Design a protein around this ligand. Structure first.
Ligand SMILES: Nc1ncnc2c1ncn2[C@@H]1O[C@H](COP(=O)(O)OP(=O)(O)OP(=O)(O)O)[C@@H](O)[C@H]1O
Ligand SMILES: Nc1ncnc2c1ncn2[C@@H]1O[C@H](COP(=O)(O)OP(=O)(O)OP(=O)(O)O)[C@@H](O)[C@H]1O
Ligand SMILES: [Mg+2]
Ligand SMILES: [Mg+2]
Ligand SMILES: [Mg+2]
Ligand SMILES: [Mg+2]
Ligand SMILES: [Mg+2]
Ligand SMILES: [Mg+2]
Ligand SMILES: [Mg+2]
Ligand SMILES: [Mg+2]
Ligand SMILES: [Mg+2]
Ligand SMILES: [Mg+2]
Ligand SMILES: [Mg+2]
Ligand SMILES: [Mg+2]
Ligand SMILES: [Mg+2]
Lengths: 427, 426
């Protein structure tokens, strides 16, 4: 009845809200393909778990009816988790498929190769519209998408590319080279995952032709895998911008121990440079014993400075991820931001001073006030550069976390504030 | 002519590296397709700028050879900026085109109606595969995509969906409604772009069918525009993480004044949160004049709380926007982080007391160390649980920014520490 009706992703939606037993049952009963796609959009931890739990006949069925990219991904999860049983689970494949999948597992999960699938539709440059169409009816079962057609030489590498729409409008006796496009856009096996995401999103494509170290066409990447690549990447960016450092972390499926590792690393690294502020506070105990109101304005200056630093840092980190800004821009950016910080200072200060005056200390009112303008102005700029610096260093700018800049602006904040206190105390 | 072999992407790459005059003359001298695609992938502001500056004739060609969701958008930008040259410009638009543009501009640009095209191919079920391929070859020059054909009824409603592959592999004599799909997942007009993005990212689709209340087909949504939507929606989410609050900010073309605005609002909110920290010290001046090592150790605790809260806040906000956590999960989380917030404290404390002892103030380590465990733990929990609440109010929980969590950790941290100092000094 409904077994033929339902669409896997209804089962994918209800998956987060269903008991283990019945789940298992739903993997076993479905038509082969629908179970296969339901397993396809699952977590590698879960994937491994089920490829362990399920019967070897259904194992055969799923493994057989799973696109090669997604297969190799699954098998890879089982290699990392349980190596021996990965090999044993690999003993249930057929020769040609086992072989293609082995040649795919060798690619890197972050590179085109590990995004790519070898079931492209490839033709030689000397057929005709009609020939390619005949081939397309007879070759459409074993293909990921018959929508774009790649034209190759005698040896493997890209020559031309070809829209299905193009053939369908083309005069069936016309040869393909007369209607193909030789300026083919493509990635490499080693190309980083986000470079594919970028290229694909730039050119407004939906299949990108991975080539090998020699140029020979060896796979393709589809935009559908790229979207969850994108989401992966944006999520990594957000995560370490929050100074947590684990690339693939699912919050719902992780124990307090792992969270503790991931957070405690950078929490620690930052807490040390949090101690330097204590020892810096130690050596300025003469201007601090003398006037106490000084201490009554340390948090507000520090925290507001860190805030501003966050703002700039993030506002640039995106603009570098979004590829909106290049390294060579740094100089030009500097000035552009600088003025802003000035205006952010004055304004903020106008508030803080109106409170310093209201706190009842109209004496150090300009110590606080001027300090706040100086702190805003500098923290801001610190925020702007740190990414640029890391770029010329060859490091991920998203490592410039909001908390790192918070602690740094705490240090600079205190130095500015206390030296300004000292200098104005000499008056 | 050799200046006409180049791909518009290439030229868009060198756009940031070209002077205004130069920009204008390249955009004014290209092939219609090229010109209009180039202009199609720019920001609204120089979009509208060049729609204004360009010559009435070239703006007429560009306007024409432009796609219709894109024409809609560009017109909409000139519409935001300058209301008159909007209709003056679209007075160059032909009625068949213009009418469509009219019908598109009415929908809200962050909704599905706002990023849809009407150049889609729809065929009635009473065809045969033969007749539909006939229709495809004959209707292909004006379509956005002929890979998904949409079967409808006499009054216009949606009835089902065909892939061109299903046609191509089907025996041409076959009736259409035989190989079609009546279980066609669609998207409504008022729908949020973000939801659209979610759908198309789930189903591994590339087109989506837009509908009215009645269920009639009004247009389709492409994956490319949904993919720029995804990038936007994201980049907005993370700006919101840095207390910057403008929907689509582009830093490289925003002036010092605009950056100023954007930031000034929340930066101001947060400084008016700090004044409280000032007064909170001020009313504890009595307990604070006794010990100075006390004040020597404040930026460390406060900043640490701010950080822990920053981490938790981030994790949970991300897991919210990713739909990996539901509003009802919060209770679980309150426990989950709890222990963690404890574990992080102790460890960070074992090191902190390490200096409190070493820095020359063995006087009383607990007033600091304990205060660290409490502040780390508490800030952690707060940052962890502010997005939940902000989400249960029908507010974007990406508003729980890292400077906000920091500044709240400044306040709470301070109350924690100076109360612990009041008790352990007495
Ligand atoms: N990897 C690639 N490198 C270069 N060109 C490509 C690549 N992939 C696809 N193309 C090109 O993109 C187009 C894809 O055709 P498709 O019909 O999907 O485009 P369209 O926008 O629907 O219609 P039209 O091609 O008429 O604009 C083809 O013209 C083809 O030349
Ligand atoms: N909006 C939609 N709602 C429901 N189903 C759809 C929708 N759009 C497309 N489909 C279904 O998805 C399939 C898309 O066909 P297409 O050839 O593009 O897929 P493919 O992955 O290339 O190959 P295959 O269809 O053989 O898996 C079609 O069979 C179509 O019926
Ligand atoms: Mg990476
Ligand atoms: Mg892979
Ligand atoms: Mg694009
Ligand atoms: Mg386009
Ligand atoms: Mg795939
Ligand atoms: Mg990144
Ligand atoms: Mg701070
Ligand atoms: Mg479009
Ligand atoms: Mg929105
Ligand atoms: Mg729009
Ligand atoms: Mg998907
Ligand atoms: Mg798929
Ligand atoms: Mg959002």
């Amino acid at each position: 009845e409904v077994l033929e009706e339902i669409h896997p992703q209804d089962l994918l939606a209800l998956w987060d809200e269903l008991k283990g037993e019945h789940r298992y049952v739903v993997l076993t009963l479905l038509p082969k393909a629908k179970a296969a796609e339901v397993l396809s959009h699952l977590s590698p931890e879960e994937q491994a778990e089920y490829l362990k739990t399920l019967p070897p006949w259904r194992l055969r069925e799923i493994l057989e009816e799973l696109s090669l990219d997604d297969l190799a991904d699954a098998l890879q999860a089982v290699r990392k988790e349980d190596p021996a049983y990965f090999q044993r689970l690999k003993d249930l494949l057929d020769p040609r498929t086992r072989a293609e999948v082995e040649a795919l597992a060798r690619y890197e999960e972050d590179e085109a190769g590990g995004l790519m699938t070898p079931e492209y539709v490839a033709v030689r440059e000397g057929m005709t519209v009609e020939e390619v169409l005949r081939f397309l009816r007879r070759a459409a079962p074993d293909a990921e998408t018959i929508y774009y057609i790649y034209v190759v030489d005698e040896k493997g590498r890209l020559k031309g590319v070809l829209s299905l729409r193009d053939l369908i409008v083309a005069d069936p006796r016309t040869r393909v080279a007369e209607i193909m496009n030789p300026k083919v856009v493509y990635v490499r096996t080693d190309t980083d995952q986000e470079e594919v995401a970028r290229l694909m999103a730039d050119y407004d494509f939906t299949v990108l032709p991975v080539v090998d170290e020699e140029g020979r066409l060896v796979g393709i990447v589809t935009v559908d895998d790229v979207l969850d690549v994108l989401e992966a990447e944006a999520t990594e960016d957000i995560h370490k911008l929050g100074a947590v450092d684990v690339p693939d972390l699912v919050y719902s499926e992780a124990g307090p121990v792992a969270l503790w590792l991931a957070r405690v690393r950078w929490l620690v690294i930052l807490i040390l440079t949090g101690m330097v502020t204590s020892s810096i506070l130690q050596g300025f105990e003469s201007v601090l014993e003398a006037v106490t109101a000084l201490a009554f304005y340390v948090p507000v200056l520090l925290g507001t400075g860190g805030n501003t630093g966050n703002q700039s840092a993030t506002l640039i980190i995106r603009a570098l991820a979004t590829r909106d800004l290049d390294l060579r821009d740094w100089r030009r950016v500097f000035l552009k931001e600088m003025g802003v910080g000035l205006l952010l200072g004055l304004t903020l200060s106008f508030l803080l001073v109106g409170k310093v005056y209201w706190d009842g200390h109209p004496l150090l009112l300009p110590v606080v006030g001027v300090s706040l303008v100086l702190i805003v102005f500098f923290a801001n700029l610190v925020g702007a550069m740190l990414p640029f610096l890391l770029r010329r260093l060859g490091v991920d700018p998203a490592l410039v976390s909001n908390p790192l800049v918070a602690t740094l602006s705490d240090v600079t904040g205190l130095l500015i504030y206390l030296s300004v206190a000292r200098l104005l105390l000499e008056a």
